[PDB]
Amino acid sequence: SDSCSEDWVGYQRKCYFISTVKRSWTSAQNACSEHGATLAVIDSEKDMNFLKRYAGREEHWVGLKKEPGHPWKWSNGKEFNNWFNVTGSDKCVFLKNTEVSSMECEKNLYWICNKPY
Amino acid sequence: SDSCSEDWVGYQRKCYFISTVKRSWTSAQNACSEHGATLAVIDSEKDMNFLKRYAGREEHWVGLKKEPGHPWKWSNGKEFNNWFNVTGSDKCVFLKNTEVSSMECEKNLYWICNKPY
């Protein structure tokens, strides 16, 4: 929310939820899954811009991860159509009002969950 | 025309031109641009109905394309106000007397160009 269900944030057909605590990517992904959500899947620029300015100064985990031998896949499973490029050299994507890059999935960060409808 | 300048088709403040050969979306768009036109921009139902019955049995490219991360935009640049829904899952819109759907922009099809005045 801050710091669809009245407590989530609705935008462009998706319900968003922002954490108040930090977690590793997998752990956060697990926290999203509990609400029937997934680490934020970004399907557009409207989405990316909303999420970035909303993340704020602190970096937040989003649903883009790369497994060693496989290509980038969204937290939901759909393969990443690469409409945007992920900098860095790590396997998990994070974002903040400033940038959208990558860092080790072990890092504890705030995260953002989203789901359709 | 068939198969404003006397050889184009005028209707509702727009001059239309129908191709006799098939081309990919981009390539057709380039062919329209040469005449100072753009792949058909459809601003109404009168337009859509004219274009559909006129396209005929064969599918023709029209000016609606979706870039990976951006929303649907007309071939001229104006964003698509979505007054009608585009079926399919591809990024380029085509139409025929029967339907108005979407197909891969790589596909070679007849196309329709239009311009104002």
Side-chain angles (χ1 to χ4, degrees), chain A residues 1 4-5 7-18 40-43 47-48 50-51 54 112-115:
Chain A
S1 65
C4 301
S5 160
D7 289 26
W8 281 53
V9 177
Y11 180 57
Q12 289 280 287
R13 294 290 185 171
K14 292 177 187 175
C15 305
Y16 293 83
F17 168 91
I18 299 75
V41 180
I42 312 170
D43 295 320
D47 288 356
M48 181 175 85
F50 166 62
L51 282 171
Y54 201 54
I112 294 170
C113 306
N114 80 355
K115 56 183 172 183

mmCIF file of all heavy atoms in Angstrom, chain A residues 1 4-5 7-18 40-43 47-48 50-51 54 112-115:
data_model
loop_
_atom_site.group_PDB
_atom_site.id
_atom_site.type_symbol
_atom_site.label_atom_id
_atom_site.label_comp_id
_atom_site.label_asym_id
_atom_site.label_seq_id
_atom_site.Cartn_x
_atom_site.Cartn_y
_atom_site.Cartn_z
ATOM 1 N N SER A 1 0.825 -1.201 0.000
ATOM 2 C CA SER A 1 0.000 0.000 0.000
ATOM 3 C C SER A 1 0.864 1.257 0.000
ATOM 4 O O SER A 1 1.085 1.908 -1.035
ATOM 5 C CB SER A 1 -0.925 0.006 1.220
ATOM 6 O OG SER A 1 -0.182 0.093 2.423
ATOM 7 N N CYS A 4 -9.718 -3.993 -6.259
ATOM 8 C CA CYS A 4 -8.647 -4.414 -5.312
ATOM 9 C C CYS A 4 -9.062 -4.215 -3.872
ATOM 10 O O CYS A 4 -10.000 -3.472 -3.580
ATOM 11 C CB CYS A 4 -7.375 -3.598 -5.523
ATOM 12 S SG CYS A 4 -6.660 -3.711 -7.180
ATOM 13 N N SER A 5 -8.349 -4.882 -2.972
ATOM 14 C CA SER A 5 -8.612 -4.732 -1.553
ATOM 15 C C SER A 5 -8.320 -3.270 -1.247
ATOM 16 O O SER A 5 -7.340 -2.712 -1.752
ATOM 17 C CB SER A 5 -7.679 -5.613 -0.731
ATOM 18 O OG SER A 5 -7.617 -5.145 0.607
ATOM 19 N N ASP A 7 -6.903 -1.926 0.999
ATOM 20 C CA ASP A 7 -5.530 -1.741 1.474
ATOM 21 C C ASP A 7 -4.414 -1.944 0.453
ATOM 22 O O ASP A 7 -3.238 -1.744 0.762
ATOM 23 C CB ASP A 7 -5.264 -2.615 2.704
ATOM 24 C CG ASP A 7 -5.999 -2.114 3.927
ATOM 25 O OD1 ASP A 7 -7.045 -1.460 3.752
ATOM 26 O OD2 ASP A 7 -5.541 -2.371 5.062
ATOM 27 N N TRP A 8 -4.771 -2.347 -0.757
ATOM 28 C CA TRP A 8 -3.777 -2.511 -1.805
ATOM 29 C C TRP A 8 -3.947 -1.294 -2.697
ATOM 30 O O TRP A 8 -4.854 -0.487 -2.488
ATOM 31 C CB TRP A 8 -4.011 -3.801 -2.608
ATOM 32 C CG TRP A 8 -3.512 -5.036 -1.910
ATOM 33 C CD1 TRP A 8 -3.814 -5.435 -0.636
ATOM 34 C CD2 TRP A 8 -2.639 -6.045 -2.449
ATOM 35 N NE1 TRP A 8 -3.186 -6.629 -0.350
ATOM 36 C CE2 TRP A 8 -2.460 -7.026 -1.443
ATOM 37 C CE3 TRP A 8 -1.992 -6.216 -3.678
ATOM 38 C CZ2 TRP A 8 -1.661 -8.164 -1.633
ATOM 39 C CZ3 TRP A 8 -1.196 -7.349 -3.865
ATOM 40 C CH2 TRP A 8 -1.040 -8.307 -2.846
ATOM 41 N N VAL A 9 -3.069 -1.161 -3.682
ATOM 42 C CA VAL A 9 -3.120 -0.045 -4.610
ATOM 43 C C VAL A 9 -3.495 -0.568 -5.989
ATOM 44 O O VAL A 9 -2.822 -1.451 -6.539
ATOM 45 C CB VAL A 9 -1.754 0.667 -4.674
ATOM 46 C CG1 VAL A 9 -1.788 1.785 -5.703
ATOM 47 C CG2 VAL A 9 -1.406 1.215 -3.293
ATOM 48 N N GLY A 10 -4.587 -0.046 -6.543
ATOM 49 C CA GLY A 10 -5.005 -0.492 -7.858
ATOM 50 C C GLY A 10 -4.544 0.452 -8.950
ATOM 51 O O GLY A 10 -4.666 1.669 -8.828
ATOM 52 N N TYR A 11 -3.989 -0.097 -10.020
ATOM 53 C CA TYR A 11 -3.558 0.734 -11.122
ATOM 54 C C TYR A 11 -3.408 -0.104 -12.369
ATOM 55 O O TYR A 11 -2.734 -1.133 -12.351
ATOM 56 C CB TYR A 11 -2.231 1.427 -10.798
ATOM 57 C CG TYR A 11 -1.731 2.318 -11.922
ATOM 58 C CD1 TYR A 11 -2.526 3.353 -12.423
ATOM 59 C CD2 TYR A 11 -0.482 2.108 -12.500
ATOM 60 C CE1 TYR A 11 -2.090 4.158 -13.477
ATOM 61 C CE2 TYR A 11 -0.027 2.914 -13.558
ATOM 62 C CZ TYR A 11 -0.836 3.932 -14.039
ATOM 63 O OH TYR A 11 -0.391 4.723 -15.072
ATOM 64 N N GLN A 12 -4.064 0.322 -13.447
ATOM 65 C CA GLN A 12 -3.986 -0.375 -14.725
ATOM 66 C C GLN A 12 -4.300 -1.873 -14.682
ATOM 67 O O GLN A 12 -3.557 -2.677 -15.242
ATOM 68 C CB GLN A 12 -2.593 -0.175 -15.323
ATOM 69 C CG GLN A 12 -2.340 1.235 -15.808
ATOM 70 C CD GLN A 12 -2.963 1.475 -17.161
ATOM 71 O OE1 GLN A 12 -2.475 0.972 -18.175
ATOM 72 N NE2 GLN A 12 -4.057 2.230 -17.190
ATOM 73 N N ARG A 13 -5.388 -2.241 -14.012
ATOM 74 C CA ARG A 13 -5.800 -3.639 -13.936
ATOM 75 C C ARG A 13 -4.954 -4.533 -13.038
ATOM 76 O O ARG A 13 -4.993 -5.753 -13.168
ATOM 77 C CB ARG A 13 -5.837 -4.244 -15.342
ATOM 78 C CG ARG A 13 -6.901 -3.656 -16.239
ATOM 79 C CD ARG A 13 -8.281 -4.082 -15.779
ATOM 80 N NE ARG A 13 -9.321 -3.619 -16.693
ATOM 81 C CZ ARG A 13 -10.594 -3.991 -16.622
ATOM 82 N NH1 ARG A 13 -10.986 -4.838 -15.676
ATOM 83 N NH2 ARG A 13 -11.474 -3.521 -17.498
ATOM 84 N N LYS A 14 -4.191 -3.937 -12.130
ATOM 85 C CA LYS A 14 -3.362 -4.720 -11.221
ATOM 86 C C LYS A 14 -3.403 -4.150 -9.808
ATOM 87 O O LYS A 14 -3.421 -2.932 -9.621
ATOM 88 C CB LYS A 14 -1.915 -4.740 -11.708
ATOM 89 C CG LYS A 14 -1.685 -5.515 -12.989
ATOM 90 C CD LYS A 14 -0.233 -5.399 -13.385
ATOM 91 C CE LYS A 14 0.037 -5.995 -14.744
ATOM 92 N NZ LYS A 14 1.456 -5.731 -15.119
ATOM 93 N N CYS A 15 -3.415 -5.039 -8.820
ATOM 94 C CA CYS A 15 -3.427 -4.639 -7.419
ATOM 95 C C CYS A 15 -2.004 -4.741 -6.887
ATOM 96 O O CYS A 15 -1.384 -5.807 -6.959
ATOM 97 C CB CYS A 15 -4.352 -5.557 -6.613
ATOM 98 S SG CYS A 15 -6.043 -5.639 -7.287
ATOM 99 N N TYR A 16 -1.495 -3.632 -6.358
ATOM 100 C CA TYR A 16 -0.136 -3.578 -5.829
ATOM 101 C C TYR A 16 -0.060 -3.521 -4.307
ATOM 102 O O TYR A 16 -0.943 -2.967 -3.639
ATOM 103 C CB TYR A 16 0.609 -2.364 -6.390
ATOM 104 C CG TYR A 16 0.883 -2.421 -7.867
ATOM 105 C CD1 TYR A 16 -0.087 -2.050 -8.794
ATOM 106 C CD2 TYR A 16 2.117 -2.869 -8.344
ATOM 107 C CE1 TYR A 16 0.167 -2.125 -10.169
ATOM 108 C CE2 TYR A 16 2.379 -2.950 -9.700
ATOM 109 C CZ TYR A 16 1.405 -2.579 -10.609
ATOM 110 O OH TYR A 16 1.664 -2.680 -11.956
ATOM 111 N N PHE A 17 1.015 -4.086 -3.771
ATOM 112 C CA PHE A 17 1.254 -4.107 -2.331
ATOM 113 C C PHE A 17 2.747 -3.867 -2.091
ATOM 114 O O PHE A 17 3.592 -4.541 -2.699
ATOM 115 C CB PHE A 17 0.805 -5.454 -1.740
ATOM 116 C CG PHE A 17 1.264 -5.689 -0.322
ATOM 117 C CD1 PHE A 17 0.467 -5.310 0.750
ATOM 118 C CD2 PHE A 17 2.504 -6.282 -0.065
ATOM 119 C CE1 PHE A 17 0.888 -5.513 2.065
ATOM 120 C CE2 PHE A 17 2.938 -6.492 1.244
ATOM 121 C CZ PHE A 17 2.125 -6.105 2.316
ATOM 122 N N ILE A 18 3.064 -2.896 -1.228
ATOM 123 C CA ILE A 18 4.454 -2.563 -0.919
ATOM 124 C C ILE A 18 4.778 -2.937 0.525
ATOM 125 O O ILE A 18 4.063 -2.564 1.460
ATOM 126 C CB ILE A 18 4.752 -1.046 -1.147
ATOM 127 C CG1 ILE A 18 4.505 -0.668 -2.618
ATOM 128 C CG2 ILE A 18 6.213 -0.730 -0.810
ATOM 129 C CD1 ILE A 18 3.026 -0.553 -3.009
ATOM 130 N N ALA A 40 6.120 -8.106 -8.212
ATOM 131 C CA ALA A 40 5.659 -7.245 -9.290
ATOM 132 C C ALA A 40 6.077 -7.583 -10.712
ATOM 133 O O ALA A 40 7.258 -7.613 -11.052
ATOM 134 C CB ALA A 40 6.021 -5.790 -8.978
ATOM 135 N N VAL A 41 5.077 -7.843 -11.544
ATOM 136 C CA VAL A 41 5.307 -8.111 -12.950
ATOM 137 C C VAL A 41 5.034 -6.764 -13.617
ATOM 138 O O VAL A 41 3.983 -6.166 -13.401
ATOM 139 C CB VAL A 41 4.331 -9.154 -13.469
ATOM 140 C CG1 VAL A 41 4.593 -9.411 -14.939
ATOM 141 C CG2 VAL A 41 4.475 -10.442 -12.659
ATOM 142 N N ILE A 42 5.987 -6.273 -14.404
ATOM 143 C CA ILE A 42 5.844 -4.978 -15.071
ATOM 144 C C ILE A 42 5.596 -5.152 -16.572
ATOM 145 O O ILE A 42 6.512 -5.494 -17.316
ATOM 146 C CB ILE A 42 7.126 -4.132 -14.876
ATOM 147 C CG1 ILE A 42 7.541 -4.154 -13.404
ATOM 148 C CG2 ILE A 42 6.883 -2.696 -15.335
ATOM 149 C CD1 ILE A 42 8.908 -3.558 -13.143
ATOM 150 N N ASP A 43 4.368 -4.901 -17.017
ATOM 151 C CA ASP A 43 4.034 -5.056 -18.427
ATOM 152 C C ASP A 43 4.113 -3.789 -19.271
ATOM 153 O O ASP A 43 3.891 -3.853 -20.478
ATOM 154 C CB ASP A 43 2.634 -5.647 -18.592
ATOM 155 C CG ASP A 43 2.523 -7.051 -18.048
ATOM 156 O OD1 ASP A 43 3.471 -7.846 -18.245
ATOM 157 O OD2 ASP A 43 1.479 -7.363 -17.433
ATOM 158 N N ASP A 47 3.405 1.275 -15.984
ATOM 159 C CA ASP A 47 3.649 0.426 -14.819
ATOM 160 C C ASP A 47 4.977 0.754 -14.180
ATOM 161 O O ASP A 47 5.047 1.030 -12.978
ATOM 162 C CB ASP A 47 3.662 -1.046 -15.217
ATOM 163 C CG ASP A 47 2.288 -1.566 -15.546
ATOM 164 O OD1 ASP A 47 1.317 -0.796 -15.388
ATOM 165 O OD2 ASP A 47 2.186 -2.745 -15.953
ATOM 166 N N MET A 48 6.027 0.713 -14.995
ATOM 167 C CA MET A 48 7.380 0.986 -14.525
ATOM 168 C C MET A 48 7.504 2.345 -13.840
ATOM 169 O O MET A 48 8.098 2.452 -12.759
ATOM 170 C CB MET A 48 8.366 0.913 -15.683
ATOM 171 C CG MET A 48 9.803 1.172 -15.270
ATOM 172 S SD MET A 48 10.941 0.921 -16.636
ATOM 173 C CE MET A 48 10.868 2.559 -17.441
ATOM 174 N N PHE A 50 5.062 4.162 -12.531
ATOM 175 C CA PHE A 50 4.262 4.171 -11.315
ATOM 176 C C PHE A 50 5.114 3.553 -10.213
ATOM 177 O O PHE A 50 5.405 4.205 -9.205
ATOM 178 C CB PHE A 50 2.961 3.360 -11.489
ATOM 179 C CG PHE A 50 2.270 3.046 -10.189
ATOM 180 C CD1 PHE A 50 1.790 4.065 -9.377
ATOM 181 C CD2 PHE A 50 2.170 1.738 -9.734
ATOM 182 C CE1 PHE A 50 1.226 3.790 -8.119
ATOM 183 C CE2 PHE A 50 1.607 1.447 -8.475
ATOM 184 C CZ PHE A 50 1.139 2.474 -7.671
ATOM 185 N N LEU A 51 5.524 2.304 -10.430
ATOM 186 C CA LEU A 51 6.345 1.563 -9.478
ATOM 187 C C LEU A 51 7.624 2.276 -9.035
ATOM 188 O O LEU A 51 7.975 2.252 -7.856
ATOM 189 C CB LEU A 51 6.747 0.209 -10.068
ATOM 190 C CG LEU A 51 5.780 -0.968 -10.109
ATOM 191 C CD1 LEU A 51 6.395 -2.068 -10.953
ATOM 192 C CD2 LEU A 51 5.506 -1.478 -8.703
ATOM 193 N N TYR A 54 6.966 5.334 -6.963
ATOM 194 C CA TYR A 54 6.319 4.846 -5.759
ATOM 195 C C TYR A 54 7.245 4.073 -4.826
ATOM 196 O O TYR A 54 7.046 4.072 -3.611
ATOM 197 C CB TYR A 54 5.108 3.984 -6.090
ATOM 198 C CG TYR A 54 4.182 3.923 -4.907
ATOM 199 C CD1 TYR A 54 3.725 5.103 -4.318
ATOM 200 C CD2 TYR A 54 3.834 2.709 -4.313
ATOM 201 C CE1 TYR A 54 2.958 5.083 -3.165
ATOM 202 C CE2 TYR A 54 3.059 2.678 -3.150
ATOM 203 C CZ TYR A 54 2.631 3.874 -2.579
ATOM 204 O OH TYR A 54 1.914 3.883 -1.405
ATOM 205 N N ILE A 112 7.803 -5.360 -3.785
ATOM 206 C CA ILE A 112 6.501 -4.958 -4.272
ATOM 207 C C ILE A 112 5.788 -6.142 -4.906
ATOM 208 O O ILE A 112 6.354 -6.844 -5.754
ATOM 209 C CB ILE A 112 6.629 -3.839 -5.308
ATOM 210 C CG1 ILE A 112 7.181 -2.579 -4.634
ATOM 211 C CG2 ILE A 112 5.267 -3.591 -5.969
ATOM 212 C CD1 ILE A 112 7.573 -1.490 -5.599
ATOM 213 N N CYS A 113 4.555 -6.372 -4.473
ATOM 214 C CA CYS A 113 3.745 -7.459 -5.005
ATOM 215 C C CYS A 113 2.627 -6.869 -5.843
ATOM 216 O O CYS A 113 2.155 -5.755 -5.569
ATOM 217 C CB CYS A 113 3.062 -8.253 -3.893
ATOM 218 S SG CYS A 113 4.075 -8.931 -2.551
ATOM 219 N N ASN A 114 2.203 -7.616 -6.860
ATOM 220 C CA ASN A 114 1.072 -7.208 -7.677
ATOM 221 C C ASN A 114 0.349 -8.441 -8.210
ATOM 222 O O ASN A 114 0.882 -9.554 -8.179
ATOM 223 C CB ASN A 114 1.491 -6.245 -8.803
ATOM 224 C CG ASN A 114 2.102 -6.940 -10.005
ATOM 225 O OD1 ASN A 114 2.327 -8.144 -10.008
ATOM 226 N ND2 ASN A 114 2.384 -6.157 -11.041
ATOM 227 N N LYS A 115 -0.892 -8.241 -8.631
ATOM 228 C CA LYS A 115 -1.721 -9.311 -9.169
ATOM 229 C C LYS A 115 -2.783 -8.647 -10.038
ATOM 230 O O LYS A 115 -3.081 -7.465 -9.858
ATOM 231 C CB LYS A 115 -2.368 -10.133 -8.041
ATOM 232 C CG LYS A 115 -3.207 -9.353 -7.036
ATOM 233 C CD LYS A 115 -3.720 -10.280 -5.938
ATOM 234 C CE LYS A 115 -4.399 -9.518 -4.804
ATOM 235 N NZ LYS A 115 -4.843 -10.438 -3.698
#
